[PDB]
Ligand binder design. Structure first.
Ligand SMILES: NC(=O)C1=CN([C@@H]2O[C@H](COP(=O)(O)OP(=O)(O)OC[C@H]3O[C@@H](n4cnc5c(N)ncnc54)[C@H](OP(=O)(O)O)[C@@H]3O)[C@@H](O)[C@H]2O)C=CC1
Ligand SMILES: NC(=O)C1=CN([C@@H]2O[C@H](COP(=O)(O)OP(=O)(O)OC[C@H]3O[C@@H](n4cnc5c(N)ncnc54)[C@H](OP(=O)(O)O)[C@@H]3O)[C@@H](O)[C@H]2O)C=CC1
Lengths: 252, 269
């Protein structure tokens, strides 16, 4: 696993911050790690800010993933830093979940969860397509040109992971639709030499994973150490797949 | 043959006192209405929802209605919670305390954009029509579905007792990705995979209530959505809906939350 440039959304806390830390700590670290976040001037951005003060490597980019203009500015801004060099790796990680029961689910929540979890990875892939294409041109591997969508087995229609812990229909629907988007990107972008894959990170001890004790749970470090290992072993025939942080096949 | 799938070919008993079909003025939805009316034991009420009920769109439905006193035409814009609300309240009043046995979420849209020109607006609109509206309609009809379940008490589940039918698509199958070469239509595919998800969740959360749920693929149907293309694989509305109704007539509680086609075959998610 050797990537010269990577962009991670939702990079200030939880799994996305884990990705940043691990990526900077790779045997051969990237030339550019772009870590996006909503409020680079907020307390929740500080851990990232300090990381950037120690690593000239790390570029904090402001990004509201549901706002097409914010997405546009973030893409101009990273494109100017890459000075026409490619983007090897896009990790769509930013996401939300809302704790609504099937009976309480609303149009608002169904819609907002979908636009953050599903539409935004599409928009961001479209906006960075030019840079991913460049990188492919400089089979299909994550070291070359890849889109990584962080999904969930909560969005597995077969498995319905963790049903007895939460219904979160807006979230499950959005994650199934993200597994479909991943398949579509895989087929649509294959001709550009761009790999796509969906990953389940596990039930991670983050703000989203919640407070519950369970020994199937994993730490941020175990989850992202896993996912990065998985990426480093992926080849063409896995493009469009849905794999977990241990590299296992998850049912759709 | 050489395949045989009796789940789809055998004419089981479908005994539904009341049904509501969304998107009932043309295409598959109109087929559902005509076939439901033509059942050996016809429903006491067939609610057919449409838009612009006295406009050109709804002409053939209005014709049908003049000839069938059991056909009730209901105005409904599925993307508008207020219109959903008013439709449920109206149907509830016509039912006079009786349950709704069968809710068919059929209304839907597809758009022709490719991956490069997919938009926020198109993704969001197709989702609200194809995925959120079946959810909201299910919530609004839940009291009446539950009343139908209570009318036929017990462990069993069937489409004659209390059922939600979501008309989905193997274009929404992540594994099969049907008709990819014909059209990418990401907004449509993502919404149908999410509808398969919704159906699954509904089967789980509504089972305790006695309500059956299932997603059906109607085939590639000769309608305005399916298009004009001459193809051996294509079915007519009569074939697709005659098939789907045989499928429903055969389902039991072991099948709740399945994804099936009009032939009764099990479809991959
Ligand atoms: N933790 C778990 O157990 C599991 C998580 N996942 C998936 O992992 C991914 C990361 O999850 P996790 O780290 O746990 O989640 P957290 O809630 O801990 O982190 C959410 C991250 O996403 C960002 N985000 C949310 N909405 C937006 C937005 N509109 N624009 C820009 N950023 C946004 C948040 O920013 P801010 O700090 O500004 O709020 C934050 O950086 C998510 O996609 C999640 O669905 C999947 C399975 C399990
Ligand atoms: N035909 C095919 O090959 C396939 C179809 N399907 C599914 O079958 C279902 C019916 O498809 P089909 O008959 O072919 O489609 P049509 O385009 O022929 O008919 C669409 C129907 O849905 C109604 N509708 C659309 N949007 C709304 C809305 N916002 N509010 C209320 N009604 C709305 C339309 O009403 P109006 O007349 O007012 O526009 C019309 O009654 C769809 O869910 C479709 O996805 C799945 C696989 C294949």
């Amino acid at each position: 696993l050797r990537v010269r440039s990577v962009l991670v959304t939702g990079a200030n806390r939880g799994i996305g911050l884990g990705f940043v830390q691990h990526l900077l700590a790779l045997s051969n670290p990237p030339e550019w790690v772009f870590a996006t976040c909503r409020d680079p001037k907020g307390q929740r951005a500080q851990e990232l800010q300090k990381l950037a003060s120690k690593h000239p490597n790390l570029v904090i980019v402001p990004l509201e993933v549901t706002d097409p203009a914010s997405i546009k500015a973030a893409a101009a801004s990273v494109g100017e830093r890459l000075k026409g060099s490619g983007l090897n790796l896009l990790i769509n990680n930013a996401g939300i979940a809302r704790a609504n029961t099937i009976d309480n689910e609303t149009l608002k929540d169904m819609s907002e969860v979908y636009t953050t979890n599903t539409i935004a990875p599409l928009l961001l892939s479209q906006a960075f397509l030019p840079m991913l294409k460049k990188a492919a041109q400089e089979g299909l591997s994550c070291s070359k040109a890849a889109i990584i969508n962080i999904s969930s087995t909560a969005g597995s229609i077969q498995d319905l992971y963790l049903w007895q812990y939460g219904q979160a229909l807006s979230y499950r629907c959005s994650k199934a639709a993200l597994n479909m988007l991943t398949r579509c990107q895989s087929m649509g972008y294959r001709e550009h030499g761009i790999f796509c894959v969906a990953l389940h990170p596990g039930w991670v001890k983050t703000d989203m994973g919640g407070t519950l004790e369970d020994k199937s749970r994993v730490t941020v470090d175990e989850s992202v150490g896993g996912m990065l290992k998985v990426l480093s072993n992926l080849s063409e025939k896995d493009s469009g797949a849905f794999l977990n942080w241990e590299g296992k096949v998850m049912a759709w």
